[PDB]
Design a protein around this nucleic acid. Structure first.
Lengths: 174, 80, 109, 98
RNA sequence: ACGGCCAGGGCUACACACGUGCUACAAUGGUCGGUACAAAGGGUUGCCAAGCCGCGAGGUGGAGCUAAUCCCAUAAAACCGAUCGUAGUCCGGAUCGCAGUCUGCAACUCGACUGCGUGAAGUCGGAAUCGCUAGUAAUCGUGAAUCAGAAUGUCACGGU
């Protein structure tokens, strides 16, 4: 949401929580890629776009089908030409982006501990799991065996480590 | 069979260095002279070693155990 | 959603529930006093008499929720050094069946 | 063997050594008339009171030979007797018929 | 001293051929509590009612305590058996029954109780050979201890 929860709550308090001077050193969240691991069995050229048929219905956006750099003869074979998929959703779709997992659908499958304690790599940590390509609204039981992956961390979009922890969260969900 | 027709376990002679040893601190292993001998469901977290004749095994006991024998810490046939 | 998984037709209504594993003699009174007729199919009658035959899916265990705890209790047996995971590390019968070799349908590949 | 055929044969007077406490402690357990406080009183019975009071370790054999297999309910003797008893006439009524 | 014995546990990495030797070939089609209906002996430390318990558990009960008695005492592959009329699947559950007042001083991550929500490999037997000339090639079950009842390829009668 970009509402009562966002506009009148996350904005004014965050200046003096950190004893900052002026307004817009509030961060913002912009981007993370799919990076669905296409490079296995990549010489197919028909079901890389199964991850177009995976990504379109549940996230509402057309992918870029991104070619890499190398002819990396050790990791794979470069004949399976495009190995990247990336989409940017909107600030006017940040409403349903905050409201699609960790609001309604945080159990991707399960976590036996969601402790936000065991990663102090000082880039704004959290602890939550979303990696299955099945856990998303508007999906049937089985019309595609669309088993893929989706890789979510986050880094800093600001100066230091402390800038993101109350900013990454909006509700009281671990 | 082996249901809960036998609810509790009130065994007197398998006991007199177990129930008395609550007030005493846990610094020594309670050695056992059987492959059968069990103890209370309210003392949970003691150490009992599998008794057969040559050497002892690591025995790790947590809070969630209700069912059957001591035959899992060391096996029945331990793959020699 | 309708019986969890998409369902092939041209077969029986009580056996549409009695779909591999918990049922008929417990649902002996369910399909007989709800009023839902066993004598015809899940579609060709009124499509309204399934609404309580669909609510049984998400009350106890589900096709998705049986996958939830299919790894928790098996994790309780593998790294605790025990014997239910000593013939799970090997792959034998565990509950004391025909023991060592030449067993029909318990070991597999 | 000599220290085997005279140490488990003495179970006639040691398994039923007590023989009066062994029946006063093993019938009302099969009765549900015991109270909820009284799960323990009937369990001071027979074990540390020295534990030759159960009978899970006795076996039936022959007398003059001592063979446990071939023993039946109609004899105190075994399978290597029946061919050599009723022809010398040691068994009554064993007659061939059809 | 294998004349001492309360014995301080370390005999199945699946990595195969197989002495192979009931069971089906998905269609007589996929899941029950019903039919003219088994039913006696050993039975003075035993066999253990109609069960009140039951969908299916017949521990307190107890008709039978020396059995032309009975406890497993209920039953037989029949009529036309249902919706729909010919399937490697709506016969399919191998580690995740947890857990339920019965031997009774000995069920702290493992047992009957099959309730069927699940996790499959059963498609004319061909390379060649177990082997069938008459009551035969051939698919209805055992009750009882030295006096305590899970003794399975050769089962008291296979009514063909």
């Amino acid at each position: 949401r970009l509402k009562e929860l966002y506009r009148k709550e996350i904005a004014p308090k965050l200046k003096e929580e950190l004893q900052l001077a002026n307004v817009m050193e509030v961060p913002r969240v912009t981007k993370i890629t799919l990076n669905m691991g296409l490079g296995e069995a990549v010489g197919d050229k028909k079901i890389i776009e199964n991850a177009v048929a995976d990504l379109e219905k549940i996230t509402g956006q057309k992918p870029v089908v991104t070619y890499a750099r190398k002819s990396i003869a050790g990791f794979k074979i470069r004949e399976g030409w495009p190995i990247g998929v990336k989409v940017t959703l909107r600030s006017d779709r940040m409403y349903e982006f905050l409201d699609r997992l960790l609001s309604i659908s945080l159990p991707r499958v399960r976590d036996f501990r969601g402790l936000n304690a065991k990663s102090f790599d000082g880039r704004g940590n959290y602890s939550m799991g979303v990696k299955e390509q099945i856990i998303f609204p508007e999906i049937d039981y089985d019309k595609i065996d669309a088993l893929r992956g989706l890789d979510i961390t986050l880094t800093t979009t600001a100066r230091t480590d402390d800038e993101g922890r109350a900013l990454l969260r909006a509700f009281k969900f671990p | 069979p082996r249901s809960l027709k036998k609810g509790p376990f009130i065994d007197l002679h398998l006991l007199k260095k177990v129930e008395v040893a609550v007030e005493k601190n846990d610094r020594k292993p309670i050695k056992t002279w059987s492959r059968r001998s069990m103890i209370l469901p309210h003392m949970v977290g003691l150490t009992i070693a599998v008794h057969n004749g040559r050497q002892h095994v690591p025995v790790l006991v947590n809070e969630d155990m209700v069912g059957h024998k001591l035959g899992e810490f060391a096996a029945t046939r331990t793959y020699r | 959603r309708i019986a969890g998984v998409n369902i092939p037709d041209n077969k029986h209504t009580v056996i549409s529930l009695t779909i591999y594993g918990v049922g008929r003699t417990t649902a002996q009174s369910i399909c007989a006093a709800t009023g839902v007729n066993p004598a015809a199919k899940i579609k060709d009658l009124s499509d309204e008499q399934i609404d309580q035959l669909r609510n049984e899916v998400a009350k106890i265990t589900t096709e998705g929720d049986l996958r939830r705890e299919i790894n928790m209790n098996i994790k309780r047996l593998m790294d605790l050094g025990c014997y239910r995971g000593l013939r799970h590390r090997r792959g034998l019968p565990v509950r004391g069946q025909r023991t060592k070799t030449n067993a029909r349908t318990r070991k597999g590949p | 063997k000599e220290s085997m055929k005279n140490r488990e044969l003495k179970r006639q007077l040691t398994v039923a050594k007590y023989a009066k406490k062994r029946a006063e402690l093993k019938a009302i357990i099969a009765n549900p008339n015991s109270s909820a406080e009284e799960r323990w009183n009937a369990q001071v019975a027979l074990q540390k009171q020295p534990r030759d009071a159960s009978a899970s370790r006795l076996r039936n054999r022959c007398r003059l030979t001592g063979r446990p297999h071939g023993f039946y309910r109609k004899f105190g003797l075994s399978r290597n007797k029946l061919r050599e008893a009723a022809m010398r006439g040691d068994v009554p009524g064993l007659v061939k018929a059809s």
